[PDB]
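Summary: Need help interpreting a holo structure output

Steps to reproduce:
1. Submit the protein chain below together with the SMILES for osmium ion.
2. Request a joint structure prediction with the ligand placed.
3. Inspect the structure token block that comes back.

Expected: a single structure record containing both the chain and the bound molecule.
Actual: see attached output.

Input attached:
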Amino acid sequence: DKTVRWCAVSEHEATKCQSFRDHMKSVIPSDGPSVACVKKASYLDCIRAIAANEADAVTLDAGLVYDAYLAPNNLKPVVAEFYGSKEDPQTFYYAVAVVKKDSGFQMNQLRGKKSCHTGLGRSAGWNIPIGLLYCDLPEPRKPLEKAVANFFSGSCAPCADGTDFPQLCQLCPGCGCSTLNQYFGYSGAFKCLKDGAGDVAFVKHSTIFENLANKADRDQYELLCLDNTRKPVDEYKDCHLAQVPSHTVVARSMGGKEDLIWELLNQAQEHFGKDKSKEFQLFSSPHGKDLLFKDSAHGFLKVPPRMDAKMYLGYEYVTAIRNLREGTCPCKPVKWCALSHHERLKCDEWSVNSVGKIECVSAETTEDCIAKIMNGEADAMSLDGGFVYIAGKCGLVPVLAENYNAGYFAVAVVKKSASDLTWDNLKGKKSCHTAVGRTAGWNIPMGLLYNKINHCRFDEFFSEGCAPGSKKDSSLCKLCMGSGLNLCEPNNKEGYYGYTGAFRCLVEKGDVAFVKHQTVPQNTGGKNPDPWAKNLNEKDYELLCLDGTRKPVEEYANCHLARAPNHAVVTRKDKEACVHKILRQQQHLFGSNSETKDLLFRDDTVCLAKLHDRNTYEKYLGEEYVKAVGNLRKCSTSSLLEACTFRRP
Ligand SMILES: [Fe+3]
Ligand SMILES: [Os+3]
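--- attached output ---
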């Protein structure tokens, strides 16, 4: 059977599910998914039932998405409720800290200020801000209300115990837990800031726009960013305390059945969703509110498969709730992320010489390591600019750049004997790329190509090629040399992968190789001893100019495709200042004074350079680079980038 066992937490919910089950039987053919209805006492009990393989799916608020993820449950987000509109689905809200313009303080100066909360126990108004501020609170932090009352000088915290902690109700005497209190709820907390009672209101990003219709009034307000800067109120996506998903269907991380859950729910919304007007309605029910799904929901979005719960909830949210759950409070060592056994070994002996200031964690791919930097399992790694773009879109920032000598040169290599080849038309030729998504092998050359053909189907433009990372059936995998499952892989087990791998591809099979200005000189004239390169001379290879002319290999200064952004080390914003300092000290000791090749850092690198204002992927890579990659992701297959685009489109 293809049965999805839905888990209900009430008798009203069990009745709706049973109607859900019966109406779907009349719309789904017998080969399709069917509903079973399991009834438990609580959301916690449904989470355990799903982990125990007694049910398959339940819909949770963000806090319970966190609980469902913790061992031994290990549930995973799989389907999202969206709200608003099909054109602009709203899946998340943003908990923000609004302040009045020019009040003169930052997020790390909240102690002693006057605070306005929507209500004790609520997400944006209490659990997230107090979760983030937890270790800032005075000891003993238990009971929490007493610690908060001795952190803010006065507050309006609706539903707090004002009898025992009267500071919490200075701005709303009694801490009235209903609309009879003018500072209660989401507008109440913002009104507590507007009327001048408090200095800061902890609310949702939309409260400001629903209580202040005209932008002129809104310009008198700002938001507190976690980097201790302020931003305007409509920049909440770059300046919030946490991004919170409203209502998430969860499932077992292994054993699913994600596939079945989505095709059940997606069919259900197409026949019984909003505006479908049948006798059964998925997002309503005659008896009781919000049964199985929120009554305000407008449909379902499939959660991208790369995403786990920590990535879905976000780093900020997870920190806040873990602080409240665990209550644990201490620059600490920088945990580098390695991609190989050989790369891990280099880090290991680096860690032991750094006397603890460096630690090592491992992952199988670059994307896995990036996800570990995002969620805190890892801290830093050095990335090609193409991965810096991905790391940036996923919330990470560049901190230092590898300097090889303004960065390296992306050039197009051809064989000198091929007199006909020109940059103006290489259509129908055989291409060799370092990998899809990398700076010199893909983003620079194919970005320029996109401008003169205006599409991303480069396997239909070149006859064939080796572009490691392309889909195994593609014209651009046919020239690759990996065997078995390694054919066309963007790793070492594919011999045409990388700067020199793409040059070898040109030497043996291809017509053009997109690499960097030093690749040909380092792999010719006997410098590379491998049989494929040993007997090559660099005078038999030329560079393709943008002109349409050609020049010798070491004339790259005036025959390049573009200047490339250097590889850079990326990190979280909260670890930027510290990663900057530890790495500056460690290269003073182990710098200019790899067992295999280019492990952790490229071997051309001389120093790790500071970046000044170019501390953002948009400012580090440049407007031209980012616009070109935006053009190319119309054909990108990056699962990590898909997960990060789902949270920040
Ligand atoms: Fe590169
Ligand atoms: Os009833």
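--- end attachment ---

Reviewer comment: The two ends are 37 Å apart (CA to CA). The pocket of fe (iii) ion (ligand 1) is lined by residues 384, 438-440, 567 (CB under 6 Å).
Status: needs-info
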